[PDB]
Amino acid sequence: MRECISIHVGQAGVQIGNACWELYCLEHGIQPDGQMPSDKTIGGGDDSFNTFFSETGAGKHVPRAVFVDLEPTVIDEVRTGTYRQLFHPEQLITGKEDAANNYARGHYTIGKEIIDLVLDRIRKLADQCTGLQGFLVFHSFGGGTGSGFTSLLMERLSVDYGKKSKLEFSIYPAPQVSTAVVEPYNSILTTHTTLEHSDCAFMVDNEAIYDICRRNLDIERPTYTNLNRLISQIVSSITASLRFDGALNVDLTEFQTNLVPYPRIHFPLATYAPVISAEKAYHEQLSVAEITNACFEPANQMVKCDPRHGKYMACCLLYRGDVVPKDVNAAIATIKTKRSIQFVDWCPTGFKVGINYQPPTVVPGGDLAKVQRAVCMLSNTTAIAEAWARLDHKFDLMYAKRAFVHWYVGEGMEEGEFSEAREDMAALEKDYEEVGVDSV
C-alpha cells in the first residue's frame, strides 16, 4: 500500500503526464506494453513502484492514472501513441468540445457533463488500492479545462475522499507560450477555488522553464516537448521518494510536514540541478557541491522570483544518484557561510535532506545530458508571492474595465466571484507578508 493516483487535466496536464509516465517507465525498466521482466511477483506485490503502478495477472504494469480533457485531440495522441498499450481505455476520458479558455466553461457549462463520469473512473482506481495515500493533480492555470474543470474536480474530491491528501502540479502562464489573453482571470479563479482543497501545490512558471531551456540547453525556441521533458525530471525528483526505497531515502510526506507551516502557505519553490547539454557534460563531472550551489542561483528556479529578497521557512534537498552524506554536509556548510539565506525567526532549523540512490534517467533523443547525480530543492520562501503579485496585477488591469468579463457572465458567473477570488488573493499576498515579519 501507499498508492498515489495521478490525475492529468487539460492539454498541459495531459502532455506533462505523458512525459512523466515515459520517464517513470524508463526509470523502472517498464516496457511500452507494460511488461517488466525484473518484476518476479506477477499480478501484484507491494514493491515501491507499486505506489504508482498496478499489475494485471498477465504481468502488465498499469499507471494509476486518469487523463481527462474536454476535447479529444491531445488524448487521442496517447490512445494511438508509443504508450497506448500501457493504459486501459477507460483511464483516457474525453469530451467533444472544450472550455475555450474559459474557466466558467470548464467548471460549469461543459465540465458538469463529464464530472460524474470522471469521478467514476477515479473511484475504480481507488477501489484497487489497499491503502490510498492521495492524489497528484496536473493542470495549467490558464486553459479553461486546466483551470475550471480542475477546481470542480478538486471540490468534488474533497467531498468523496475527505481530507485524503491532494497535491498539485500547476503550470503558471508565460507570454512566450500562452494561448489566451484571459489566462490571468482563469489563474486567479482556479487558485481561489482550489486553495482550501489542496495540501501542497508545486507551481511551474513556463517562462522560467522556457528560459532554462534557452540558457542551459541552447534551445533557440523551446517547444512544449522541451519543457515537459524538463518538468518531468522535476516531477520525477519529487515522486522518486515514493516509487523507490533505500536506507537514506526520505518520503515526500516528511518533506511536506516541513514545507507547510500553515494550510494556506503551501506553495513550494522548486529548483533543479543540473540542467546541462550532452556537449557540455562531456568530460565535466558536476560534483555534489556544484549542483547544490546551482540550487541557490535564482535562474535555476522553476518560478521566477528572488528568494535572496525574501525569507525562508524551509529548505528541503532531494539528492539522487551518486551522493553520500559527507559531501552533502560540506556542500551545505559552504552555502551557509557564502549565501543570502535568511530564515524566519520561528523556524530556527531549517534544512532537511534526503538521498535516493537510483540514478537519474533521461529520455532517448532528449536534450538533457545523463548525469551521475542530481538534486531537486524544495524551499518555502515568501518570494514565491511575487508570482502572485504579477498575476494579480494583470488581473486588475483587465478587471477595472471588465475586459472579457462578458464571456464569463454569459456562462453563468457573476462579478461577485471575480471580486471574491481577487480578495482571497489579496489576503494570500498579505499572509506571505505576515509570516515573514519577525516575532515580538
Partner: protein, 422 residues
C-alpha cells in the same frame, strides 16, 4: 470534429465564397470532383471543419449558396469547383433584390428564408459538434446585406450558443456608384452589432486603394479585389484549418479578440501584397496593408492576432513581434496585457514562400463607421430614396435607431481608446 457551416449570400457573397472554396480546396489538395490528390497528412487532419465526407472518399463543402437572383447560381455552378457543392444546398429566389435592404430583410427575403433554414438544419444535424456559422456577404446590395442579416437573427434563434462569424464587405463610392448603399450598410451594421460574435470588415475602399496605389492597377475588377479577399480569408482561417495552438476554433478566437461584446469588428491585413521576417512584420502593421480603410496609428489596438505561414525561424518571428510592440507601445491599450498573439503554420499559401496575415481589433475602426455615417447622413437628412424602404413597410424611426446605434458604437471605441490604466 468541430464543424463550421458556411453560408454565402448575394452576388458579393457568392463571388468571394467561391473564391474562398477554390483557394482552400487547393490548400487541402482536393480537386473539383472532391478527391484528395495530395502529398501530406497535415492536409486532412481537420478537413471536417469545412468538408463533409461521402463515400468514394469524396469531400463536399459544408456550404449553402443563397440568392434572390437566379443567375448567380449558374455562374457558380459553371465556375471551377462549381460541381463540388451539394446541389440541394443551392437555394435561389426569382425576383432579385435591386439593392433594397428592406426587400432582403423584411419582405421578399422573409419568404425565402425558411427554405435556407431547412438546409442549414440538415447540415447542422449531421455535425459531430457544430462550432458555428460563417457568412460571406456585402452590406451594400440588398440580398447579401438584408437577407444575410435576417438569416443571422434566424440562425442565432435556433442556435443561440454557437459562434456567429461574418465576412462583411463594406461599400465604397470608388467601386460601386449605387447611390443607396449607405442605407443598406447602416441597417446591416445595426443588425451585426447585436447578433454577430465576430465580423471581419472587408472594405471595398481599401481593396481599391491597394489595387490602384500599391499594385499599379489603373482600373481594377472585382477579380482583382477578390484576389486580395481570398488571400485574406485563407489567412484568417489558417488556424481553424490546420493543427495549431492559437485560436484553433471560432470561440477561442472570439475569446482572445472580443473584450466587449459589441466591439467585434476587425481590421484584417495581409503581406506581402502582390521576403524576410522583419519585412513581413513591419508591413502587416502598416496602414497600407489593411483590408479596412483605417489607419491603426489613429487609434489603439485592443487585441491582435497575427499568423505567419512558410518555412521560417520562429525565434526570428518572436523577436520581431516583440520589437513591433516595444517600438509601438502607445498604440496598444496598456490595460489588456499580452494582447497580441502569434501563430506560425509551416504550410505557406499558394505561390508564396512566406506570408503574414493580421487581424486587429483596433479602435481606429471607427474611421470606417464614420465614413459610412457621413454618406448615410447626406441622404437621410433630405429624406432621399426613402420611398424604396417605407414602400416595403418600414418606418423612419428604424432608420434613426440604426443611426444612433452606429454612432453609439463609434463612441464606445473612442471611450476605450481614451481609457488609461489609471
Amino acid at each position: 470534429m468541430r464543424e463550421i457551416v458556411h453560408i454565402q449570400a448575394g452576388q458579393c457573397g457568392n463571388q468571394i465564397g467561391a473564391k474562398f472554396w477554390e483557394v482552400i480546396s487547393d490548400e487541402h489538395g482536393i480537386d473539383p470532383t472532391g478527391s484528395y490528390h495530395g502529398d501530406s497528412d497535415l492536409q486532412l487532419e481537420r478537413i471536417n471543419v469545412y468538408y463533409n465526407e461521402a463515400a468514394g472518399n469524396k469531400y463536399v463543402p459544408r456550404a449553402i449558396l443563397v440568392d434572390l437572383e437566379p443567375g448567380t447560381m449558374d455562374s457558380v455552378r459553371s465556375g471551377p469547383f462549381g460541381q463540388i457543392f451539394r446541389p440541394d444546398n443551392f437555394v435561389f429566389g426569382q425576383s432579385g433584390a435591386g439593392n433594397n435592404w428592406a426587400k432582403g430583410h423584411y419582405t421578399e427575403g422573409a419568404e425565402l428564408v425558411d427554405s435556407v433554414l431547412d438546409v442549414v438544419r440538415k447540415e447542422s444535424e449531421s455535425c459531430d459538434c457544430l462550432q458555428g456559422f460563417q457568412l460571406t456577404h456585402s452590406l451594400g446590395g440588398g440580398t447579401g446585406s438584408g437577407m444575410g442579416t435576417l438569416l443571422i437573427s434566424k440562425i442565432r434563434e435556433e442556435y443561440p450558443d454557437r459562434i456567429m462569424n461574418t465576412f462583411s464587405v463594406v461599400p465604397s463610392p470608388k467601386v460601386s456608384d449605387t447611390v443607396v448603399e449607405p442605407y443598406n450598410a447602416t441597417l446591416s451594421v445595426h443588425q451585426l452589432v447585436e447578433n454577430t460574435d465576430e465580423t471581419y470588415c472587408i472594405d471595398n475602399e481599401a481593396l481599391y486603394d491597394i489595387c490602384f496605389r500599391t499594385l499599379k492597377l489603373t482600373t481594377p475588377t472585382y477579380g482583382d479585389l477578390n484576389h486580395l479577399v481570398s488571400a485574406t480569408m485563407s489567412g484568417v482561417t489558417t488556424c481553424l484549418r490546420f493543427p495549431g495552438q492559437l485560436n484553433a476554433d471560432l470561440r477561442k478566437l472570439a475569446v482572445n479578440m472580443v473584450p466587449f461584446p459589441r466591439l467585434h469588428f476587425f481590421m484584417p491585413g495581409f503581406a506581402p501584397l502582390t521576403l524576410t521576417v522583419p519585412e513581413l512584420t513591419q508591413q502587416m502593421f502598416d496602414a497600407k496593408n489593411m483590408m479596412a480603410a483605417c489607419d491603426p496609428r489613429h487609434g489603439r489596438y485592443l487585441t491582435v492576432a497575427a499568423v505567419f505561414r512558410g518555412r521560417m525561424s520562429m525565434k526570428e518571428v518572436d523577436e520581431q513581434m516583440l520589437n513591433v510592440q516595444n517600438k509601438n507601445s502607445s498604440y496598444f491599450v496598456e490595460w489588456i496585457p499580452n494582447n497580441v498573439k502569434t501563430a506560425v503554420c509551416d504550410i505557406p499559401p499558394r505561390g508564396l514562400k512566406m506570408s503574414a496575415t493580421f487581424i486587429g481589433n483596433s479602435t481606429a475602426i471607427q474611421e470606417l463607421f464614420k465614413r459610412i455615417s457621413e454618406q448615410f447622413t447626406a441622404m437621410f437628412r433630405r429624406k432621399a430614396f426613402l420611398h424604396w424602404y417605407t414602400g416595403e413597410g418600414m418606418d423612419e424611426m428604424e432608420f434613426t435607431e440604426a443611426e444612433s446605434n452606429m454612432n453609439d458604437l463609434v463612441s464606445e471605441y473612442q471611450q476605450y481608446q481614451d481609457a488609461t490604466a489609471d
